[PDB]
Symmetry: D6
Subunit: 169 residues, 12 copies
């Protein structure tokens, strides 16, 4: 598996990944639905550093998934992490490798201090995946985000740069 | 079940323009009048990411164009919107209306998280009034000489449905 | 009493009229709180025809109140009416005269077809005032607007140009 | 049979050809032009201007019959001036009456205008009585109103009201 | 005695006051307005627009007598519409004839226009015969032309040509 | 009762700038850093009607400047905001805090109609934690090494209060 | 022969007509030499009324020449006339017909009052051509224009609208 | 000798505007019409450094305003210009004209280094023709119905003077 | 006693006067200038530019003591160059040590920078050992680095890290 | 006689760029440096109608590219210009130089009507000095350490030729 | 054999590929980027910016050998930083010496710069002595200068003057 | 005597210095005559480095003269020098000191390589002044500049940085 910076040609893949996520899609904190809306927003934020995205491909260049770093704050050296694996490739064992490649980039190239992510409390499976990748819960946000017209509680988990880089030393 | 709602794209504008044929009323795009296709496309480029209105192309499994679902006057302060549905003449008497109305309500109340959807129906179209009544809408107003149609003012019923009613159904 | 078009020098009066209305103030559908915000919005919409405002003064040029015409639609020739009387001059008997002067302008100078207004159902006193000025209820809007964090029902009342101008003939 | 379709960019060639032998300056939203490239740039400039509205007249086989123009569209006084141009080939086919009525229908039922007026040269009484038969009535005889072939001409202003055209 | 002076920014207050009790919407270069601040910004916007030209009428002691307006100035057909407004105080002093002639002189000798027309309400025959005595002649009786107090009104269009006003 | 909240004006910027004295942290205006007064005023002119943040000057009956109530990260999608309160040093130990916190909550929940207010407090300031707890806030997170203070990362408590709790009180 | 308004496709012909005229070419009073300069100037003045040009073609659409009206003054209703016939078609007898077609347009469509032209004194042949087309000398301009580094005298000839239109009446 | 030419400044525009009184001809500033002082000042700000025209205020030793020397149609390609001189009515019959004409010629031929100055004089003003003839000018044209004056076309003499003649004098 | 205050527009006169006799071109955000009007327009241009940060040094009685400059602020490598200018009147009052420490404190606790460096002329060993006593250490001897009085000069680059200045 | 001068077009820029090969000096376009072809084309689009410089492509009858004639520092105040000529290496010793120099002088003195052409030649290239001397140029200056060439200052001769000399030849 | 050619738009793909496995953020005129589309827009933005100059290194058969970069070009102090990147395929072919000399030749004879410096990681002594053999000399040992793989590194700054490279 | 960079307040002095120089004044190669033209040009080129000017004042702040550096070329490190001493202070002995102060700035602060100046051949006095300040003639430019409508020859004199700085060593 390979992480490649997002290109214009990858926007179709991005649009298709939102097929039945049953939630409003956002591009640099701006909502969109159509492909033409997405392409206009991509042209607008092509140099915006607030968010960073990587397309995950395999040896045969099949589009496996998407790695996103959003809310990139260079003051506090923080960023939020989101990973989306295409439905067809969700049951193969790629999540852990992609989470670690994303953490390596965040902590070695972006030189960030802290990476955090949000997981729905009703999704306990994801909590253990991220716990097994080194993340630890730092918050249980009450009625944080709306899903299907009802407020949900969300867990916030984190991992620090010093731990990730010096874990085996 | 076979019907699908898809966000409007540029290639769908020809369908929009054709839907205006023999409707005997000036067409508007984000409250701006237009008649020609080139006027429509220019207004589409201008409001590509204006969120005051949202439109969805309704297709069947064979990708035949069935109709259009419009959400206009989207007010994010009061969390309300006006709903219009236009079924192509060749598909107008096949019973698609009720399904599309519920799809529109689902998106309005679960993705846009709106509080109230309202719609206006000509008083001289009592069957449309009863169709929306059977889909959950209730009359909240009988607006006198509200709108001009073919050079003469006409009364219209304003009917509403609240998010609380649709979600607890 | 005299109706005078609003001027920049009247913005202080506008700002003071919102002292304890316990609701967000809007200028051409844009929210504001501070005076500097209001003055910037006034410079922005100085030629916008969507709204029209008149300052009510007495013989000694005391600022009595404000007459507002908003949602001015020149397609349907409609407009919404709002009248605000300063607290000190609320118990003197000016409301009726100002409502009629406003209707005269709306129907003779703007040549509008219909004037409507919204009254809180919990404010029955205002309903009878407007009923005594010729307005008639055309709707009981359910949970229309938010006040103090709770949705309210609002009555919509109307008066037509033909009735007002030909009432005594 | 005849159809009225809003003017598109692809119809500008037809507009240009209709001006070939009119012996008077052509105007697009009150701006003079002659070449096709001038017209096209004026079209791009006024694509959203609502002061004028034009319709291409076609038949069942999509032949270009003529053009219906509504100019001087004043939305405060709710008035507009009406002009009709039928291509030389189809001028003697008796299409004018239908196109005048379709133009009035749009003016009074879609644009909801109050008054439609038109100007006819004093020297063409045939057109005068055609418009009279469609409902128009003379309200003025404008003296030396417009210039034609280097000489001022008088024109008849004829009008028809929405109240007359629309019968409940 | 009477003087015609081009309108300046300092005269906008006079313009605003002249609109106090006319019971009709005021327009500046065909844009509606009511407040003084709206007028002033419209003045700054059209300061170089030549579609209209206005003159303040003053007396020897610099009192503001009235206003001469030339609107709809069309430089291709060489025509313009004439309006005159005399302040209520000086309306019965017999100034109108001189101001109409001074306005025509400017129109025909400075702007070199070919035709000046004006519109007079059917219900004021006094003004009709004043303009007739200054040389104007009726060329139209426009039916339900303009709106006044919520009702459509007919107006007389009156004209005078440069050829008539100018005698070598 | 004597204290009053007033929307921020240009003339209040000197007060804002003086409030930054001896706080040992870079000041931000709509997430843009600044130190000098001229930098502040320029950023104020730029964000005069940016609604991502709202500020209120707290005064007493004698119009003495007591402090500042800030609402930042105002998110109208999730209907949430972050709350900061800065009391001038000369008024910091007089018991004004609880009153101002409730005033801020009232405006947040009755005028902005927000769903959730949250705030961040340094873990090494346990008395501030308990003050907000006594005003209705509850801890939803213990964010590890979240913010830089004097060149060293520090943990902060995230505490929240929901609109439903404050309104039904 | 036919007079046709100049189009972009005719610019190559314009450029070729300047091959060996041994004088600086101008487009709306701006000098040019290259084709790319000419095309940029044409895009700049596409709607400028100060100059008007017509391409002269025959029945087989061969490019015969160019008719130019420059210094078009709508205040005095005047314009300067220049005619250029391609070298290959200079000895066939077209000049007179093109001069009269140009005068007809100038006096019937542009409704101009006076047309004038400039002829080099050392070119007496052209003087008699224009004299035979109705032009009369009104001036002998001394050292008016530079040609091959030396000042030349130029004759100015004119024709009025009243004469041309009423000559045969 | 007492008379002085001074480049035009903003404070001299009132003098320019007053000079237009009772001249019975539309005034132009860089070929743009104007009547009011505010129109003049705006056009002055626009052409402050346009070199197509140059104007000089003529004063006496006591700084009384005598007149104006204008150089218009300044053509730097042909090195020519048109000369107009306007003496204030109160100074029009005192013999200043010849001195000012020579001053203007000196500046034109020694500072602007022009090759030819020309001027236009009404044929019905034969005394002005002879004054310029006595100052070195010679007639090169009798332009028929060249200019409109009080609604009627009039003939004008074009007279010239060359740099070689003035310098070798 | 001494105070560091962010630079304001009113302090530009002080900046200009500090350049009077430095015999080298003055720069504002790497743009050269000499006149006060040039400085003021450069100030308006870079008012929000964060590549440089300056502080006016004042005493208790609000006398202008000097200026602390942080230039070449690189937020990716978290580095910046430090310059200090004390007015000739107060140069021998022993203020430099306190101002260097206050500048480092801001650099390492407010801007959270990792490394602060400075350049000192080889020919001034007094300043070299002052900075050494404040914690700086030489990391380079740049050969013919900068131009002074028409001749290239060598400079010592001295640095201090955040890890050293900050002791938990 | 076979050689021809043609105004520079966009398609000739590749020739210009190739002419810069192995000249060991930074290239300039209207006094702006450039190395790459894309830099050249962008600067060409920017100065398409800048008249401070004029360039001509020299071709033979078979349309083979022979060289380039440049006129730079064109000063229309003093009516002067600097002349550079670059012959392609493959054509540099065939005797074309003298013909091209005269062609350039002809255009400079008969079409641009300039008064003086000057050129600079390296003192260490005495044969070029004598070639221009045989074409009419005369030395007016020996400029000491005027220009940098390969990192070292070099003296250059400035030689001139006046319009009066070339025309009376 | 080897050629240095100014960078063109068509060479941006080569630039992007050269960054594939460098494990550090890539910069174009001090702006970070990763994707090709980001690079291309940064190229269009800085096409005329003279703060940096790059040359593509090709062989006789037009194979892409490497890249010569001159960054931090300061035209007042007449200095610039030199970087060279040879594609992995051609790294062991002994091309570096020739490319360093061709880059210096351009820097000192075309740009007429006074000083060229470069930064080399402390941990690569081979490159240090390569540059020493081409004329460079160490002027600094910058402590914790740059970040690599999440850890600060020391770098050697090496310089060469125009006076040394150019011998009359 | 003191050299001070030019400020806006010095423009009056600049304008007065051109009173009777009988030559067109230029500001960054743009001609001007009036003060308002000069002030507009100063605002335009306030940051332009192509020219540099210094006002010469005495101890009592009397305006003595002006030092100008024009044609400042940073490629070749050259600049042209012009010095203007007010008429009242021309016979006191200031020229030499100002020329040397100007050379010191040019060679120590601007670090230029060469300074040159132009002197009219008919002004031999100035030639010896500059020769006594170290300048040497490098050219006798033939008919270089126009004065009073006739071309003049001009001497170009120069001084190099190495000579000036190392003259006494």
């Amino acid at each position: 598996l390979t992480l490649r910076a997002l290109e214009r040609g990858d926007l179709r893949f991005i649009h298709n990944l939102n097929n039945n996520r049953n939630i409003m899609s956002y591009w640099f904190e701006e909502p969109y639905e159509s492909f033409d809306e997405l392409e206009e927003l991509y042209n607008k934020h092509i140099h915006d550093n607030a968010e960073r995205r990587f397309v995950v491909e395999d040896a045969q260049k099949n589009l496996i998934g998407l790695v996103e770093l959003i809310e990139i704050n260079y003051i506090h050296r923080s960023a939020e992490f989101q990973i989306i694996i295409a439905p067809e490739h969700q049951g193969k064992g790629f999540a852990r490798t992609l989470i670690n490649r994303a953490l390596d980039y965040s902590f070695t190239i972006l030189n960030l201090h802290k990476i955090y992510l949000h997981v729905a409390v009703e999704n306990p499976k994801a909590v253990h995946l991220y716990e097994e990748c080194g993340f630890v819960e730092e918050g249980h946000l009450v009625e944080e985000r709306l899903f299907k017209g009802r407020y949900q509680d969300v867990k916030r988990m984190y991992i620090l740069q010093s731990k990730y880089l010096n874990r085996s030393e």
